[PDB]
Amino acid sequence: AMIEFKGKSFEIDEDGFLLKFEDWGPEWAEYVKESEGISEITEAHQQILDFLQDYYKKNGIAPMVRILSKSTGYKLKQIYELFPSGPGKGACKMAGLPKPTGCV
Amino acid sequence: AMIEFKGKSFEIDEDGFLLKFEDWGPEWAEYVKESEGISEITEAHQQILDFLQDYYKKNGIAPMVRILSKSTGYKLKQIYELFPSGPGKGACKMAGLPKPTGCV
Amino acid sequence: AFVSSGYNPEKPMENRISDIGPRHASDFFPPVIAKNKGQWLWHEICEPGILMHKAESGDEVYTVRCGGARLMSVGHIREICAIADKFCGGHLRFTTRNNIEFMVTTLDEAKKLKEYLNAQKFEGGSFKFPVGGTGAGITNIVHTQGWVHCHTPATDASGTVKVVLDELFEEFGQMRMPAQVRISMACCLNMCGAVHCSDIAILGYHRKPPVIDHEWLDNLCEIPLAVAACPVGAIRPTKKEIVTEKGETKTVNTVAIKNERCMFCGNCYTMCPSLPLSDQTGDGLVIMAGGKVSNRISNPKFSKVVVAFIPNEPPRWPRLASVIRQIVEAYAADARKYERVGDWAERIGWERFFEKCELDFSIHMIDDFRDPAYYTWRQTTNFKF
Amino acid sequence: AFVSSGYNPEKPMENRISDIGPRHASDFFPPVIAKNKGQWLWHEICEPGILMHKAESGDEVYTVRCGGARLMSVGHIREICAIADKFCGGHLRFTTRNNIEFMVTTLDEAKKLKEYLNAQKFEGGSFKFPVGGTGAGITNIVHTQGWVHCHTPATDASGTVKVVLDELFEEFGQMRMPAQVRISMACCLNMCGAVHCSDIAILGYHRKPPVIDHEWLDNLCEIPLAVAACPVGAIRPTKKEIVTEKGETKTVNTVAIKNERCMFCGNCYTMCPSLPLSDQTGDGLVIMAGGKVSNRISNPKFSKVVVAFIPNEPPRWPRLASVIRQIVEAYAADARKYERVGDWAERIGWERFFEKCELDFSIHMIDDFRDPAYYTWRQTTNFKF
Amino acid sequence: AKHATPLLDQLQSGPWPSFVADIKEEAERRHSNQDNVEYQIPVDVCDDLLGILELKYSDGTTHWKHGGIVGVFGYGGGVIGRYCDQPQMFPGVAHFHTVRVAQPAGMYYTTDFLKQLCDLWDMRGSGLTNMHGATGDIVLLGTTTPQLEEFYFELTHKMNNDLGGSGSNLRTPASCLGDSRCEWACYDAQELCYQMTQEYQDELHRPAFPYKFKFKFDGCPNGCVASIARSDMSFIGTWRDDIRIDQEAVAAYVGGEIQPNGGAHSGKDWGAFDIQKEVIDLCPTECMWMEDGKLQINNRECTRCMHCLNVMPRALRIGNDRGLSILVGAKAPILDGAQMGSLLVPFIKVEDPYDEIKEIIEGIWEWWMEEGKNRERLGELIKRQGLAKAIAAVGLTPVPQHVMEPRHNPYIFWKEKDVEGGWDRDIADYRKHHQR
Amino acid sequence: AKHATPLLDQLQSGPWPSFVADIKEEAERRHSNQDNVEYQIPVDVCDDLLGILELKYSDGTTHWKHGGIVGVFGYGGGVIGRYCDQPQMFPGVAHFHTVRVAQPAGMYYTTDFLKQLCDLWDMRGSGLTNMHGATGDIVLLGTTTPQLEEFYFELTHKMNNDLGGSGSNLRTPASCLGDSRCEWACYDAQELCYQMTQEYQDELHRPAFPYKFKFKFDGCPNGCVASIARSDMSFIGTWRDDIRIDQEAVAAYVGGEIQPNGGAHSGKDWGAFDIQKEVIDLCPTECMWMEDGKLQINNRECTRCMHCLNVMPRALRIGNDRGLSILVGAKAPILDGAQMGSLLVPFIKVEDPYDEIKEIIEGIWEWWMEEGKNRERLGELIKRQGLAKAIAAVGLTPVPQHVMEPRHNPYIFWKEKDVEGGWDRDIADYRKHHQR
Ligand code: SRM
Ligand code: SRM
Ligand code: SRM
Ligand code: SF4
């Protein structure tokens, strides 16, 4: 499915994930935030998004939850305070990473 | 022990192997042949010597016997005709390679 | 037509109850269970499908067990409740093998309930609640999602289970086996249940490497996860020049798979949507036997490969039905009292299991996975001709 | 003083006889053996150290077995011949465990020979030819080179064996064991004999990583062989700046070993003279038990680790002598007729073996080597307290 | 009906309850809608399920797209999203997510509770279930994304029930029916299962782990919930004192007055009960014998395998000194091979509030959460770093019971501090004693 | 005494033949030299061996330099060279090479031959031996490089005997004593050993292989040369027809007239022989029973373990239909773990010139010589490329006897030719049926 948000357009799956990471834009996070229960993207949300993106750019994977915590200093409970769906469905989606896979 | 042969100096062990490969000279083989039952170094001898030095230079090991046969075209029987002590004690010694190790 | 429950999508974290867990079982016990819990003294099987327990107080409870298809409609649950309301004061349970159990206070009530249960039929003639599953017979088959819900199956759980239980049906309401036979089923080698540890096990198997969707792989997959997904190291990261289905030539990150090195486990697909591998004629079934979880006499055992391949034959899988029966019949005729299928097989020797069950033997049965493989070969001259 | 054999160093390949192999055994059989070979009917042990065989012809042969040190002077061999010339028509044999066997024609001769052999003494009091090694006793100890000749040992073969056989001596010439006990010895984990498959086994062990002779390593070693020698990937190639014995500063190709990844097998030293590891206080002994090669009742078994370290204590190794006797005594007192040590250990359970033999248990006994380690652990609730 | 199902129709006959017959019935009850339920997902959901399944039977491959990430706010698992791969042909299963619902321990139900859950699912889902999922959950099979929160709201508010687990988390713990209806239960398996489930609600709802982790609780070694094969941490009851023998009941078995094994074998002629053949000669440690018509057991040598108890429930009882063993690392083949639980704690007392057991659980997690690689099961971490590490992690020292057998390969690691003189060795010291 | 030996002196006492006393005796004989031998190596060789060994007892480490490459022309192995690492302190063992001399099968000798060998070694070596090396060689312990060719020349010319093997070659084959003096030998083990040694003289004298290889020959499953643990190719006798039973002899055992196991247990009181307890109840397949005082055996179910024959040698005999089984892969731990032989050929007839056995040997070698890595034993190659490959290489098909058990992990390889449609699949074909 193609969608339009603020004159930019993105290709998305049934789950709301960005199909193509190179198709990313600064408007992506703002398109998503509503469906992930977020009023505004604060600085704390952004440190997490930036980290997820850098980590994916460098390593070709999402980081383990343990690594995300130790790298950004947000404990799991705080990640859920920021992203109510958690690090996968919330943060990773908002960051423009590929959908998490495995026995989810 | 240190030895002298036609005004050249080589360091050797009890088995007559050359201690330092960087210390190799074209005299080394001529010094060795008597102890290894060889009257004179023939072209066939030399092809084998050359291959061993080259293989040690490239790979940091001596070649397996099946590699030595197939790469030089000399069957095992012919190597023994050329080098009566075999590819290890005869040929590798003459080429200036290290003593073979393991349960010999 | 949308009807709100009271949830407010505009305020999703308000009025949210969470972290409350399951109900406590004591919410649901029959009175006789609640009274005597912890004080049970002994049990007996009264007859196929009917259990009795004696408590220290003298109290007795009779349990009547009947089959369940596991997959069931709400209408079937309501029918189960109807039965429970009429006969059981509104109480019932399900077993770890997905049979249904109804409890009453006397043998005569249990006998009347068995007779009522056995009389119930679906349109087509199948028993709704066939009574059995107790003692030394053949009970329900623990199984998985198959083509009803999962994306990684190589076969169908619900269908294969139906075929096998029809085939063996007469042993459910009878106790003629050397020991209760546990048959299990999984539709891929994730083995979501008890395949690795059952008397006889049915396992969906693939026989063809993944088909790589190069255009989408890097966009939909974390490549190193797919690479690390392989138990035998057949996958490596690579670049590749491709023509997209739009006609554009471009070079992508992707993987390459050495076909002769892949053994079709499917795990790279679990990690990577662009690596599907399912195949009509390639996919089928492996049969395994001789595993168990109890510690009775012998230690728990893994089940072993005993049939390399039975093809999928939807909807009736006759070759499957035929093979299980054949295994069961050889076991029931030969094994000693109390011997599970693995007890029997190991005692007579696998060389005799294969002959007795009239199964072929091939390359496929011989372990070749890492250093442990070696221990499964025969380091002894103790063999039978 | 050099005396030529006939060989000519200037014509080395002339009159060279080669590829003639061993002698045929029929060159050497006693007449009774030559005549009855292939026609043997049955045997008996007449008494410790004396066997009899009956042939189909009715012929009998009496074999008298005595101990041997394996390591042996020509003067000792010449004395073995003298014995054989006087009593056995100049014939004799050695066993696969390196005992010595003399064959005669009647029981009376055999008894006289035993009494003679038992009378022979070295200066210092040791028996030259103690009689026994038959039936359910303790026989000779198969062993290796140790400090007499090998460069990879972590202990001495001839010494440890002398110590253990003194300690157990009375069991050699008697048959009071539940089954014959095979004790073996190897001085490093190359195991150049039977350690991996004996009832009790003594094994030379290191506990310190190699000391790297960097100045010489590339000159004396094929570096990639040393890297590949390591079962646990503790060795890797590297360059390194060093100061030579002469005080010159250069950079060499060498190896680096991660100490925490090394388990002291010594194999890199076998491949590479610049990686020696022997150490006076680090080196010692491991004890193993429960192995066997026969197929009698049970299948051949590997011996298992039962003592993690006994220090080397040359010349008398008292702690070794003590530990072996202690294992042998618990086994002889508890095991059932015909049980090998391993049969015993496995039946009572290793938890009871450690308690009956009063042995400590640690970290060190628990397999951690690759995927097969998993199988050695306890996947059952069947254990004793 | 909506779709022809010629292949699936073959599964309507034969004696075993037909999943096809049932789904056809449910499809029909939706079409009829006798109770005027305002269906929240497509009416024809079950007709489209049969349609797509039939297509699978026809072409021999699954028709579910890969994966799916759906759920409810606050939770990072609980729902398995699924989308059919032919949404135009089968719009009724376009969304077809499964909701995992926390079950009571031992799966006892009142019709009150089940009927209420059926009302809920009838309206907000497909009307299809699994009773139960292999891990234990009540499984509700098939709903749409927008209904996930609605159903969850009613489940929590009206039913006081929670979701079960999925993902890299603690999964739903299950138990055998324990002492509710069994004379062998060595501890209150249902209660421990309940209490652990409540204690670790956070670890269940919000995946925090390198991979999935499971608990299962067996009341005794028979393993009626199969914890030894199907849980990362397996809790299996025993006793450590003597089996209790009623000699009069022994004599009654011997005399033919009580069927062996509760009559489990009554369908076949195995002859009259023979205690020597069926009990004494089968005990794996050979620790039983008959003396003057009385059964004797040398309990020190009993491994508690259950066999004699299973044969003579009316004569032999579990001991009075009760607890459980904990075994670690069971898992299915991927990646490094199938494992069953390996003995870690041979015996621990079971006593609310279960601090000792919590100490083991948390010792293991602390270790595994730190050291575990991505998607490495506990059992694989144990193979990688060794059993000795697991034993240390829970504050124990190695005992012979920790192994079936000692290692035979002698590749034995030593810690430097345990070796006299340590490892700081200079080649020059060595060369003073040994010429190159 | 050239050196003080106060540690070694402690091993002169105690009952077991003292290697110290003996070596001291030999050193004295060389010193006295009362037969006027022109000793070819240092006279005090044994003194210096005692000295260097004493140094080792003192400092707890070996004093031999690493390795040594010596030999005779024409041969690639046979002699293990050695040099002491303190040649100034112990000039007598500065060179201390071991010569491996080929032994007769079953190690039968005449004094004629041994005296000849002694005269030779006295003169040209140290006068110290090992009888025998673990592989089976006559070991002559200690000589000098210049003497290697002189000794060889006398050994071949005067004695008609060859060197044995060392290196990456066929090593010296050994047998049990076979039918020379045993009622259970199922084939002439000494003969097959001899003949195989002769057939492959080139592969033993001239290392051609990736690594070492050994043969060992056991006449029956008792394994008196231990081939199953100590040879890459192990050959073990059996029969495939019935055990021959002498019932009168059975009745004599039962009646106390013959001691069980040929009197092996006579040193302890184990009670009177009880055939039921000692034979019938111990048979691993439970295939024996007593009926009206006569022993019966269900031979189909007999795995030929030898037990009953060993207990009752005067009543039970091997069958008439004899051959051997062939097992492959045994080896010490380094690198990948210890192995015993794994069954490859369940039964093969033994018949000069043994062509069929030579086909197995050469098929295995042809495979291993091509595919084996440097220093990879056959056992390791079997683990690397799999047992099925070994079965293929000797031209057999897999049979259930090839395993103790079928695999449990389901990581199963298929050859493409065996799978309908093969492996050439297009993603477009798949996408036709399954939407992304
Ligand atoms: C993934 C998926 N599973 Fe599942 N699974 C259920 C239960 C099990 C059990 C038995 C148990 O919990 O008692 C096992 C074996 C024991 C173990 O945990 O290893 C099991 C295995 C797996 C694996 C293998 C994990 C490994 O090798 O270590 C995977 C792959 C992976 O983790 O990457 C995997 N499972 N599973 C049961 C849960 C229901 C409940 O809540 O009680 C099932 C629904 C089976 C049933 O029919 O009862 C189930 C199924 C699944 C797949 C989802 C199926 C669906 O469409 O709903 C899933 C999630 C595959 C996926 O979506 O990637
Ligand atoms: C190397 C060295 N060995 Fe030796 N070895 C003799 C015999 C054996 C046996 C048993 C047998 O042949 O019956 C084994 C185990 C079976 C097997 O072949 O694996 C054995 C092992 C080894 C290994 C391990 C090989 C592996 O793990 O795959 C090595 C290391 C390697 O090959 O790199 C190794 N051995 N060995 C026996 C032969 C005498 C004969 O009959 O001709 C010994 C002399 C022992 C004895 O006292 O009887 C012997 C010894 C040796 C080492 C030194 C010999 C010496 O005279 O000093 C030697 C050659 C180590 C070396 O010098 O590099
Ligand atoms: C002489 C010798 C053969 C040879 O030199 O070629 C030999 C000779 C006999 N063996 Fe043995 N075996 C000999 C090495 C072995 C070995 C090799 C080893 O120990 O390294 C084994 C395998 C050990 C193992 O099982 O791990 C061996 C396992 C047996 C067995 C089965 C083992 C058991 O005790 O249960 C029997 C059967 C029996 O003894 O009842 C046996 C029986 C026999 C018989 C009775 C065979 C016969 O009928 O003539 C011989 C007399 C046994 C006795 O003295 O009690 N022989 N036998 C070897 C004597 C070694 C010694 O000096 O003590
Ligand atoms: S596991 Fe034990 S306690 Fe639980 S139901 Fe089964 S037999 Fe009873």
Side-chain angles (χ1 to χ4, degrees), chain F residues 9 15 98 128 134 139 246 256 275 294 367 373 395 397:
Chain F
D9 292 348
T98 281
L128 303 180
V139 164
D246 181 342
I275 194 169
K294 295 171 158 215
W367 171 46
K373 280 156 38 210
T397 59

Side-chain angles (χ1 to χ4, degrees), chain E residues 176-179 181-187 189 217-225 306 310:
Chain E
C176 67
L177 58 68
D179 65 7
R181 203 195 67 210
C182 183
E183 63 273 34
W184 300 322
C186 289
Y187 67 96
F217 300 86
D218 271 309
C220 79
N222 291 329
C224 298
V225 78
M306 287 306 284
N310 294 338

Side-chain angles (χ1 to χ4, degrees), chain D residues 52-68:
Chain D
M52 193 222 79
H53 286 77
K54 245 270 193 287
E56 178 65 49
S57 69
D59 281 358
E60 306 177 347
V61 67
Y62 292 85
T63 297
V64 183
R65 185 179 298 155
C66 68

Side-chain angles (χ1 to χ4, degrees), chain A residues 14-15 17 34-37 64-66 70 76 80 84-89 93 99-104, chain E residues 65-66 68-71 73-76 80 83 166-167 171 206-208 210 212 369-370 372-375:
Chain A
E14 292 92 333
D15 277 319
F17 284 79
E34 192 74 26
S35 73
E36 289 312 314
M64 295 180 61
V65 180
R66 165 180 77 234
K70 291 204 271 204
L76 191 55
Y80 275 89
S85 281
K89 180 169 180 290
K93 185 189 286 181
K99 214 206 276 187
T101 62
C103 282
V104 118
Chain E
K65 295 197 182 172
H66 184 284
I69 304 293
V70 305
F73 291 125
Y75 284 176
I80 310 294
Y83 303 103
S166 66
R171 300 293 177 85
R206 301 160 194 96
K212 77 182 75 179
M369 285 176 64
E370 181 56 19
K373 270 151 24 163
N374 191 250
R375 275 186 67 84

